[PDB]
Amino acid sequence: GRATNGQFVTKTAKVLRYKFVRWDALLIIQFIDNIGVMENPTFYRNKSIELRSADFLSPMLNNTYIVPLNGGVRVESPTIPVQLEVILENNSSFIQVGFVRLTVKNGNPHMIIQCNPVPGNIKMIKIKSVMLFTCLIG
Amino acid sequence: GRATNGQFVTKTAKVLRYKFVRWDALLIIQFIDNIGVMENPTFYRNKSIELRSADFLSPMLNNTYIVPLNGGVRVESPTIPVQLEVILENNSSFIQVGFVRLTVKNGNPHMIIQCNPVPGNIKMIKIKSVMLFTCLIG
Amino acid sequence: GRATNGQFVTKTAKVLRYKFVRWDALLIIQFIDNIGVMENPTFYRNKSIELRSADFLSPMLNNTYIVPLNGGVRVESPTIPVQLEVILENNSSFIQVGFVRLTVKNGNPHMIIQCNPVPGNIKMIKIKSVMLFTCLIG
Ligand SMILES: CC(=O)N[C@H]1[C@H]([C@H](O)[C@H](O)CO)O[C@@](O)(C(=O)O)C[C@@H]1O
Ligand SMILES: CC(=O)N[C@H]1[C@H]([C@H](O)[C@H](O)CO)O[C@@](O)(C(=O)O)C[C@@H]1O
Ligand SMILES: CC(=O)N[C@H]1[C@H]([C@H](O)[C@H](O)CO)O[C@@](O)(C(=O)O)C[C@@H]1O
């Protein structure tokens, strides 16, 4: 078909926009808030999906940050690796290969973001990558 | 169509289950043994596909671990990055971004797992990621 | 449908071959110059897409290497992580998880390759991964 619009919404009401295509057993979904642009002929600007502490569940264990979501779609996605910047409370930051999924618990979608140990508590995780999940249904 | 079930089997007879969708030139395949769950409202549990030494070919060169497989499907997949835990024989372990493919040699499928140098011989590689390959046929 | 052939071409006229499948809103595209082979029953050979300095725009900022392309297709792809080897001018080299995209500026396709800091100027980036992008159109 053609690409349908949609979004999820976080605890703090941040809106995660996306375009999808549901085919037979197949759901493909791209998050569209941070598509990066060449601003001019020589510079590439990454954009971020900024997720703060208050969008994650507490406690956090095993550098696993869970983002309970609302609305949107209910998928058990594969895992995709992405570019993360992780901001510590002291404003230190660390660029990492993070690993994201969509999963469902109690019929609610959640984003699973896993990354590496950091020397502090995290203030914010920025996702600098354009994310697309190809999911299988049923 | 709807998602068909399938599996590969290793030298040591470990069974690698998967769901797929074959469309025209297109084969999409997700491994389903290690789909991770929120066990309760706050904890996310990763599962592993555990591959021991005896599932790989010898000799091993360039931190490339080849897993000759049986049955299943014959695809030259793209490369997907995943979360690996690599267990050394002294039970030390290292978390890495590993890179997997499906390829075919002498009409047999093989899994290609590449990762980083470690200070020892490897006892086991665990794949903590949900793997899905989108492959092109012909 | 069945997988169509195609290519892009760089500033220095290097040819980037690929196979694709355009469905309704969906373009899937695999680069085919570096599909890796088991050369014999025990050895896996990676191949590279070798990109030299003269294929990138200048100046380079934020370890972001832009490869302006010609012909081929015009897609705003998601970001895919890949295996990079980065060769310095002193022939030192660094293996990295790099992150690639296809994007369009002034109606021209460009490849966006991002990677980590290195202690020197880069002579060449080799992409050791088989790249496939699943893109959404419109
Ligand atoms: C990945 C996965 O299987 N998720 C499932 C979870 C967990 O499996 C439970 O913890 C097992 O009881 O269970 C559900 O029934 C749920 O609560 O929404 C369906 C959901 O898709
Ligand atoms: C990635 C790839 O091309 N794999 C192919 C290999 C190698 O190319 C050979 O080493 C070249 O002789 O060859 C086959 O004929 C084979 O033995 O199964 C088909 C297989 O798909
Ligand atoms: C990712 C993205 O949006 N790229 C678009 C760019 C930039 O957005 C411009 O810098 C905004 O003016 O604009 C176009 O009009 C262009 O020049 O080709 C279309 C292109 O797809």
Numbering used by the authors:
A (entry chain A), B (entry chain A), C (entry chain A): 317 to 454
Provide text from the study.
Here we describe the crystallographic structure of this carboxy-terminal end of the TAdV-3 fibre and confirm it as a globular, trimeric head domain which, surprisingly, most closely resembles the structure of reovirus fibre heads. We compare the structures of the virulent and avirulent fibre heads, and show that, in both cases, the head domain can bind sialyllactose.
To obtain information on the binding site of sialyllactose, we soaked crystals of both the avirulent and virulent forms of the TAdV-3 fibre head with 3'- and 6'-sialyllactose. Electron difference density compatible with the sialyl group of the carbohydrate ligand was observed between two trimers in the crystal lattice in soaking experiments with the avirulent version with both 3'- and 6'-sialyllactose. The density for 3'-sialyllactose was stronger than that for 6'-sialyllactose. Density for the lactose group was absent and this part of the ligand was not modelled. The ligand binding site of the TAdV-3 fibre head is located towards the lower half of the trimeric assembly, away from the 3-fold axis and is constituted by residues Glu392, Thr419, Val420, Lys421, Asn422 and Gly423 from one monomer, and residues Gly352, Val353 and Met354 from the beta-hairpin of the neighbouring monomer. The sugar ring of the terminal sialic acid is oriented towards the protein and faces residues Thr419 to Gly423. The carboxylate group of Glu392 interacts with O4 of the sialic acid moiety and, together with the side chain of Thr419, makes van der Waals contact with the acetyl group. Val420 is near the C4 and O4 atoms of the sialic acid, while the amino group of Lys421 contacts O8. The carboxylate group of the sialic acid interacts with the main chain amides of Asn422 and Gly423. There were no significant differences between the ligand-free and ligand-bound models and overall r.m.s.d. values of 0.3–0.4 Å were obtained upon superposing them.
